[PDB]
C-alpha cells in the first residue's frame, strides 16, 4: 500500500498502542470527527468542503516584433541605458537566450518561466554596456554607485 502525507487522530489505550484511527479526509464523517477531535460527535447538520469546477481549455489570443536592433549596433553605456518599447507583438525570448550565453539571470517579484507562459500588456527590452565584474553595483535596489 502506497503512503502519502495525511492528518490522522490516533486513539491511544492504557497500553498506548494505536487501536483506532480516523483518515480525516476520505469521508465527510471522518472530516467532522477530525474537526471536533472526537471519535463520537453529537448528531447535527454540519457543512463540509464544497465541490469546485475543473479547469480546461485555456484560451490564449495571438505580430512577432523584430529584436534585431537590440542585438545589433553599439550598446550605449549604462548611464546612456537603451530600451525598445514593445506592444501588441509576439516575442521569442528563447531565441535571445540561445543567441547570448547568460552569465547571470535574476528576476524580482516575478519568475522567468512565468513570464514566458503569460502574455504581458507591455514588454521593454534593455541593451547597454556595463562591466560584468560590477554585478553588485547595478541592481533594481542597491547601494552600489
Amino acid at each position: 500500500y502506497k503512503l502519502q502525507p495525511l492528518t490522522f487522530l490516533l486513539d491511544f489505550s492504557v497500553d498506548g498502542y494505536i487501536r483506532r484511527a480516523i483518515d480525516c479526509g476520505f469521508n465527510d464523517l471522518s472530516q467532522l470527527h477530525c474537526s471536533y477531535e472526537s471519535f463520537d460527535v453529537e448528531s447535527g447538520v454540519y457543512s463540509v468542503s464544497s465541490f469546485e469546477a475543473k479547469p480546461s481549455g485555456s484560451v490564449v489570443e495571438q505580430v512577432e516584433c523584430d529584436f534585431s536592433p537590440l542585438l545589433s549596433g553599439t550598446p550605449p553605456q549604462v548611464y546612456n541605458f537603451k530600451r525598445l518599447v514593445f506592444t501588441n507583438c509576439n516575442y521569442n525570448l528563447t531565441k535571445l537566450l540561445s543567441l547570448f550565453s547568460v552569465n547571470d539571470f535574476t528576476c524580482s517579484q516575478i519568475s522567468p518561466a512565468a513570464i514566458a507562459s503569460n502574455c504581458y500588456s507591455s514588454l521593454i527590452l534593455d541593451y547597454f554596456s556595463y562591466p560584468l565584474s560590477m554585478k553588485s553595483d547595478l541592481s533594481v535596489s542597491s547601494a552600489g554607485p
Binding site: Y36, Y46, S47, S49, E52
Partner: protein, 330 residues
C-alpha cells in the same frame, strides 16, 4: 428653537379641579421593530482561503485546526438563533383561536386576511424591503445565465428553519387569539371575539366610555378602519420604524458582503488574491507570499466571527424582549 411646549393645566386651590376631555379617538399608530434575529451565515473554510488550490491547501493544513474552530463557532451561533426562534413561536401554543372569516369585520376594510400565505400587511413590508441573502435554485441559476455567494465560496447563506407561510398561519392564529385572550374570563375563552373588538371590555379598559358613547364608538370604529388604512399607506422610509426594519435587513446583508469582499479581493497589493499565482512559477516563492496572505484572510475571518457572535447575543436579548411584548401587550 426646537422647543415644542408640552400642554399645561392650572392647579386649583379648591378641591374641585379642571379636567381635560378628548374629542377624537384617533385610533391606529405605527410601531417599532424589535430586530429579534440575525441572518444565519456559515463560512466554508479551505475553499475561500487558497481559492481551491491544492498547493496552498497543504500550507493551510498547518492552520487547519484554527479553521475547524471557526466553523464550530459559526455553527454554535446559528444553533443559538434556532433555539431563540422556537422559544418565540412557543407562545403560539396557547389554546385560544378564532375561525378566520373572509368578512372578519362588518364595516372593517382590514388588510389581515391572506389574499389566497403572508397576510397583505406582511406582504407589503416584504415587498418594500430588498434582501439578496437567500437564493434557492433562482439567483444562483440567474448568475449562470448572465447569488455570487456560492461562486465566490467566501460564505454560504443558511435558511431561517421556519416556513414564512407556516409562520404567517401562526400569526393568523394569534389574530384569533388576541380577542379571546383579552377577556374578563380566566384561562382561555373564545368570548364575543367580534373582529378583535372584545365587546365593550377592551373599550372600557382603554377609556371609561358610557353605553350611549359605545354606540357612537361603533360609528367611530368605521373611522378607525379608515385610520388603519392611512397607517397601511404610511409605509414610507420617512417613518423611523419602517426605516429601522430596512436598516436591520441592510445591516445583515452589508456585514457578510463587506467582510467577504475583504476575504476575497486584492487584499495585500503583493498578495493579489493568491500570492504569486502567475507571478512566480516556483512553488517556494508562491508559498511565501501565500503564507502572509493566508494569515491576513484568517484574521479578517476571526473579526467576522466575533462580530457575528456579538450580533447573535444581542439578537437573543432582542428576541426575549419581543417575547415579553407578546406576553403583555398582545
Amino acid at each position: 428653537i426646537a422647543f415644542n411646549h408640552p400642554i399645561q393645566v392650572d392647579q386649583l386651590n379648591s378641591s374641585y379641579f379642571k379636567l381635560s376631555i378628548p374629542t377624537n379617538f384617533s385610533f391606529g399608530v405605527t410601531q417599532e421593530y424589535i430586530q429579534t434575529t440575525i441572518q444565519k451565515v456559515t463560512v466554508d473554510c479551505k475553499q475561500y482561503v487558497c481559492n481551491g488550490f491544492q498547493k496552498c491547501e497543504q500550507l493551510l493544513r498547518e492552520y487547519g485546526q484554527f479553521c475547524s474552530k471557526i466553523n464550530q463557532a459559526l455553527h454554535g451561533a446559528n444553533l443559538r438563533q434556532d433555539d431563540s426562534v422556537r422559544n418565540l413561536f412557543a407562545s403560539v401554543k396557547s389554546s385560544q383561536s378564532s375561525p378566520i372569516i373572509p368578512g372578519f369585520g362588518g364595516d372593517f376594510n382590514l388588510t389581515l386576511l391572506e389574499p389566497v400565505a403572508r397576510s397583505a400587511i406582511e406582504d407589503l413590508l416584504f415587498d418594500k424591503v430588498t434582501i439578496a441573502d437567500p437564493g434557492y435554485m433562482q439567483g444562483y441559476d440567474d448568475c449562470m445565465q448572465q447569488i455570487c455567494a456560492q461562486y465566490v465560496a467566501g460564505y454560504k447563506v443558511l435558511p431561517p428553519l421556519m416556513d414564512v407561510n407556516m409562520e404567517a398561519a401562526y400569526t393568523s392564529s394569534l389574530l384569533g387569539s388576541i380577542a379571546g385572550v383579552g377577556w374578563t374570563a380566566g384561562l382561555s375563552s373564545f368570548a364575543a371575539i367580534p373582529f378583535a373588538q372584545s365587546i365593550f371590555y377592551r373599550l372600557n379598559g382603554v377609556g371609561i366610555t358610557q353605553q350611549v358613547l359605545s354606540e357612537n364608538q361603533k360609528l367611530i370604529a368605521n373611522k378607525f378602519n379608515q385610520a388603519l388604512g392611512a397607517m397601511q399607506t404610511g409605509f414610507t422610509t420617512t417613518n423611523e420604524a419602517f426605516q429601522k426594519v430596512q436598516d436591520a435587513v441592510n445591516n445583515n446583508a452589508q456585514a457578510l458582503s463587506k467582510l467577504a469582499s475583504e476575504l476575497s479581493n486584492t487584499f495585500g497589493a503583493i498578495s493579489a488574491s493568491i500570492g504569486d499565482i502567475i507571478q512566480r512559477l516556483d512553488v517556494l516563492e508562491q508559498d511565501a507570499q501565500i503564507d502572509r496572505l493566508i494569515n491576513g484572510r484568517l484574521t479578517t475571518l476571526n473579526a467576522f466571527v466575533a462580530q457575528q457572535l456579538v450580533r447573535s447575543e444581542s439578537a437573543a436579548l432582542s428576541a426575549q424582549l419581543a417575547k415579553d411584548k407578546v406576553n403583555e401587550c398582545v
